[PDB]
Amino acid sequence: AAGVEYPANRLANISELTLNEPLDVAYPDEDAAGVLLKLGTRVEGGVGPDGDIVGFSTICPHKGFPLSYSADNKTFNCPGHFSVFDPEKGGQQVWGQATQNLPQYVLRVADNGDIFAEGVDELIYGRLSNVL
Amino acid sequence: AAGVEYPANRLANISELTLNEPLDVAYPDEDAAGVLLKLGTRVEGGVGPDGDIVGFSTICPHKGFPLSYSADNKTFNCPGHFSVFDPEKGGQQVWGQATQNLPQYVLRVADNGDIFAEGVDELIYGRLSNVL
Amino acid sequence: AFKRHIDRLPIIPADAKKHNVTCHFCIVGCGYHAYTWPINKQGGTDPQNNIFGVDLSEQQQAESDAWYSPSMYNVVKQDGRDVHVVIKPDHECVVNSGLGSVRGARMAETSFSEARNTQQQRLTDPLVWRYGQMQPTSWDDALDLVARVTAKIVKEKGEDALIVSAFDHGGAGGGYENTWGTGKLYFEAMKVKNIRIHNRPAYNSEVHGTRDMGVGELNNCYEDAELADTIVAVGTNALETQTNYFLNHWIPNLRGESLGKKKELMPEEPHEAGRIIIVDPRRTVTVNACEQTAGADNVLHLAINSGTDLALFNALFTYIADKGWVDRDFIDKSTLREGTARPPLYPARGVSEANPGHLSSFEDAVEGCRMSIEEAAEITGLDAAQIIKAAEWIGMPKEGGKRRRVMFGYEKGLIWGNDNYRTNGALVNLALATGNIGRPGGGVVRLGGHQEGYVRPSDAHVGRPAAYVDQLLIGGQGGVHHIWGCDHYKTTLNAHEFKRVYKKRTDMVKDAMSAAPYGDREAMVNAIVDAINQGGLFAVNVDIIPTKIGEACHVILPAATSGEMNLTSMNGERRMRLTERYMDPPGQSMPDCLIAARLANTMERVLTEMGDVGYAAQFKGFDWQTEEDAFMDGYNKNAHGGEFVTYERLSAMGTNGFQEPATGFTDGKIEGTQRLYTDGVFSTDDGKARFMDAPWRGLQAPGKQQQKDSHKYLINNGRANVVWQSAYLDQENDFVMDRFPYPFIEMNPEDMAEAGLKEGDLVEIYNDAGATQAMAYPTPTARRGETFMLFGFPTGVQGNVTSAGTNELIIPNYKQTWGNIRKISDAPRNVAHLSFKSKEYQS
């Protein structure tokens, strides 16, 4: 009761990620598209030994279009109404129509090398509760 | 799931109340002591045709002692640490150690005259959720 | 990044109370609904238990109506009780079709809530300077003081001693109810000459040029942006500043989504996808988005030298006239054919300061405006090929000899740009010559700023040119100042000098008030008036927050804003709507129209007591108890077709409302006017439009060429998408302030390397007007020597470096500003979290 109860879900292992190549994932369920991304530099919310593995919702929080990733810029870009998000700065909207910065996963790197997601810092598009 | 779900409970009928004589009651369950009180003047949260029927938790929100009612003063008084609450002013702490004003019931008077409680505007002492 | 950490929101139930709401903010006037329901009741996940009739236990798809963001949710007081509210864009509204901007989508979160602690900055009680500081008091006390001081000064020195600054606009902080109330106070009860508007320092129009020509500035509809062959966007950054007009009407044209519609409404005429000409010195996200939707081949960005628009338009006019690409029958039938002689001081100056340009026939305008492609290329910095291409895109007939439909749109790049009167006319010339007024796919229009909501008594007494109020104040004239809903400290021109003198003059009265006994009110007022006689100023602020200029005022009166009151206004299409009240004003705050009424009543009482019964009588006609009373006394009785409009009737029409003026009422529908001038009869005595003989004469405002020549950088200035106006609400909004704690100044990275500046460095911008601060934001698209600074911003006011320079009609020339830049500090810690990446969407 009180708070939303987030599940602790395995998303991937650290060995699956290549520098600057986003890995498709879903959290906190099948229907909530996101990505894991290794950025190569220490950044807010980032985990792993280099502190550079982040996880975000990949669905624009304005009107729900799927975001595309620019590798040269390291930004998420929205084809709907031209929003831009920075995963090197906690998903800050560089410019856009969303009243939210990009929802970011609370990640944990296990003992072995598995990456777990245990929460999300903002409301994911298309749901009035992050856990349904 | 959330937003606390209050039950709509019958507490009494308007005909049961005498001017300035509190009627012992319990809401939102058996274990949550309170009173209904007809004050004789229109007051905040008050219902009925004269707008003077109020309902409060009778358990001090500081340390949980049972409140006594003074009829001459129209106040609830706490023997624990000398707090005083005004049911003519939304249960405002006139003076006391509680960081809350007296929790007040959201009342509704039905067509037949029955008084229903459908909510409480502040956290009742001794529970971390108004509905257990 | 700022993150709210709100995992879930209460679901709007099936029985929520629905309110029609127009966006508080920009000209577009997007439609919303506010749903409210008792605190401690809620909706559920099954279709029967929520307002949408949808299963909310499933992820919604893109563009779903069945979702809202946290900034659209709050808890607010309604008739004394806390209620949940969701303010959600309306899918059915033809303006926005469900879109909400980063601004509109946070109306809920920028509303007042004691429950969730939003906007606690909001004023709740009248404040008066006494006992050494600002102190709260009652309305009776505060109004009595304001009335007594005002009445004494006006009796002793005349009404010219009363200076007024007031909104004239629509929407939150304006509207018909509120412009009528203030209007009636200062123009009916009184005859205040020394009055200025919220965005300019005199009582003038922004667009005298177009109006004098017979062409009202809001003549088309938003559908015309969908139907035009070419859109000409001048001095507008529409994606950031008219967002949803751009997204919901311009984009479909550029994408080719409109073709079906174009062919139905205009068969037997060819149609390709829309092309767009953008006239703007700076490459903006608007340019980028057009290129991205239409293709680079269909976007023509004319990156003119700052303030050279008039040269551009004159060249275009000449070329098009010579080629014969003009609506010949429109010119003959609907425009002035009478010759008329140039005034003796032409072309440097007009017949007087009241008339900077010469109105005339097509032929005389062409001869007078004449400029070659080559001369215009020198002035504008454009290539000859670019200017010719523009003329082709505006004037060249389509395949079968059919006239090209062009919608001409302009905003503040033009209006606050060089030679406002003549540039406006030069643009209008193009619309008139090509017959693109009063027809589908046409128009020459303001893209606008605030919504519109103006109705007031005659302003004849004010004069043309009107008094330059800021210069009066800076020069030590005026005794009492009433400030309604604007903040010159952040937003006026020559702002640094203005603040130095305003502080010094209001301080005189503060020191007087602190040293006088308040409880003996006659002594207090005599002390105030003595300070005024010595050159002080007594200042009264009517507002919703503690403002910057309010730190100099002696009385503050708390206003209620849209949503806490009913309010009516029209958008940039003349689409009029009622915003239905859904919450209570905070504390004891009251709507501006009622404040005006209450002030009037106090003036009546006080003057009656003093024994000036004659003057007292002038303040009658203010017995209003609710804002609707102001609507009925103003709009209903005084607007064109007002007799057809009431709250009840507007309410039934919803967020779509109707387009002004009303022409009738049948079967529960106010009948409106889609486009102006469809009959070719214009707003002049004889009904003919005039062209303007408007020759280029350089930078015309005094000081400007001098300032350009003696400083290093252009300090262009304007809006950012996230920030609404002077950040009056945004300064208490973490999402906005987390993104830009300081105002940015967009700088070319090589300009920065040259000056030893790094991203985030705090820099002083300075010139002979004043100085200010901003945060260096590296911007690859910026041209060398050309910076752009966010305007109006509390943590760095760019108005400080704008000069006192205006045109003849006292139009402030904000956009033409030059200055030097130097480093104040290495990037502060509170700026380390910001992204400094490009704002341009990459595909």
Added chain:
Amino acid sequence: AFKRHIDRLPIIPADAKKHNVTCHFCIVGCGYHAYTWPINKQGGTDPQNNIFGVDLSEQQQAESDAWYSPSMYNVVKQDGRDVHVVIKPDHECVVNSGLGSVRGARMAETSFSEARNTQQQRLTDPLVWRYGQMQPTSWDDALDLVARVTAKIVKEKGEDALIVSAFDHGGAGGGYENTWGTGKLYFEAMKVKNIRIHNRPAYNSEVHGTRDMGVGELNNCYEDAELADTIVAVGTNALETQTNYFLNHWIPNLRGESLGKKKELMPEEPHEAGRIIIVDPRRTVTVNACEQTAGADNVLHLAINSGTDLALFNALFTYIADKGWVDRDFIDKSTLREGTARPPLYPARGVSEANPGHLSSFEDAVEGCRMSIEEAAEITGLDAAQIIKAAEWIGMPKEGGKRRRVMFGYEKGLIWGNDNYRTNGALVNLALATGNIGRPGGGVVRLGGHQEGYVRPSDAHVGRPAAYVDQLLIGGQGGVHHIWGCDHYKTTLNAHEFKRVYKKRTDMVKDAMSAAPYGDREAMVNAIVDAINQGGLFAVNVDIIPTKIGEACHVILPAATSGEMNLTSMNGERRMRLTERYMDPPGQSMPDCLIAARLANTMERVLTEMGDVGYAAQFKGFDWQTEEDAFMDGYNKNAHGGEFVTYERLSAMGTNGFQEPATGFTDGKIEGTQRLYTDGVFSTDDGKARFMDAPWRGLQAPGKQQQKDSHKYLINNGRANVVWQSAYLDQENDFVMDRFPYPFIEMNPEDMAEAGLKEGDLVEIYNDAGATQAMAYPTPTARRGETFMLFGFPTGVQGNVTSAGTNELIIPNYKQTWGNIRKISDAPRNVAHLSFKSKEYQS
């Protein structure tokens, strides 16, 4: 009534991080724990899933540890991450035994939260006055400006040009770390004479009298209130102002709950239930509660005429001495026996201003203080029978000839009352004569205000009497002012005059700064210094919120406060504790000790650049990176027994800590001192206590008799239970502001009837010092002609009507104030919701 509408709170989980926390606020120093855990994790209802090990799905009984109120919950930043926090009183702490006051119980809710929008008023960045307004900037910039101006002034005019106002207290806004840092800056690096404390306008002690006699003012323990036969409470409203000391220690005595304990520790001595003498002109809720717990027969309320305490005590001393009810062996063994002559100007005046009283032997004190019961009855207004009864309750031996154990406690009724030096001594005389110092059930002590946390270098250079700083400032002297953690605008004496001049003088520097170029910093500093040379003042404010006096300052530096830093202090029992950091400072704010360090470092740099390397060198010894570094350089190296105390060791001792001074360390326990003077060796050169020959000489502060004689009402003043200090946090707390939007003035209902005033009316209080406003609160228990106004309050500052009058040592005589009252306004709308019922508990 304000209602949060919070239906449920997150449950603290089993694995929450625990922090020891002392209350931020009052002297009692109640124990709390702060529990924190990740946002989006939570506890459950079953015992295994929460910190209490209890089934939380069942209603808890009275006094349960397994509950917390909404004001004890918030969301705060911790090491960069949002976390839940609950700050909950500690059941195991011997101070409070689980009690939390209305103040302490809202530490969480008055903490800074971006997530839940609490206390957004909190400062986040350094601010500097430039470009017409206050503007944010970096630390390097802000510190450079402060250092340059300060250094220039000090070089040109000497250190006397530097004025300082600083906290000297413990707890939030003080503590050992912070008093050391500021102390070291201004007394070690510099030798600042012109320095004042937060609550008084010179660098003096509140209690020179008791100290000069050899009796440190915090000599007992809180257990002694449980063990005394009689408590004598003077000038204290303990239920409202030392709430939990009163509730958890005095009440058990009065109720008879202590008898078991009394008999175990003091067998072979009789014990009845405690009786209490309360010396206070006003009947307070404290008196009411004592009567209600002990019975009216056991409470003796001496409602003395304002400022007549000394008469009372002298009479009591005389009566007790004559009856022989004195500890004869204590007098002979531990007090001065040497005869010593009265100074030539006695009894009107002492040997000098440094020494207002004459220290002496018991016998000489008795002869000098001599006053009959009848003389004291005239002066005090009491009945002879009342004064005799008090003597009996203080001095009369118990059944078997055993001495009566009396705890004498006093606070600001005495300390800010008439003739501070002599009244303090008169009271101490009674304790000394009855042998009630250093023994169980005894003590003559401050009941205190803030917690204590003072350690600083020698202050010898300051002088005695020290400089009256407010008079220097009001007189146009001083150049630079550093204000740390106090707000004279709300809380100084003669405040109305103070504000008028302070504004005028700081305005001079503001106008200079506005007109100068900031980016050229040398020109800016020269402009500041020119304004100072002409009589201006450059003011720097170090604080946590935008303060009132801060509206006059030119630089504001943001502080971190307790909880955002580790902090150490002692309570009124000398009980020292560490408050362990549980959250981050907001924005870029930093602890005061580190601000001081950084300022020192900038002074070193700037003076080095100016070429005064010698003076630069004085500012070394500030290489501190964390608050613990300040603790180790200060307390650890300088306090008595400091070598035994470390953060690590204090942490292991929990909220119970230990009582200072430390005398050793064994097996994880700092060994302390329960009571002072248990050996009968006092704090004088020869180790003997002195009595005080302290004859009554009327109202001694200049102006006071005159002010009394020429005005209608006593304007008594002081605390309210709900309001903490000057409402610096409370002004952004809806629960407090909903109850008292204006400060109340308690008035007798027939005084109100006579004056034509109604409950809630807004009234001006005025006299020859100044004027202010308050809300009439009808108070049946108030005596005719005697009003009580809440002090320090932003919406009506009663310090405005207090005169400049001090005693010889510059102690402000706030409590003796008289003035006239007249109506400003009928009760405002924003006051209609208030209860005006009696604050006294009715059975």
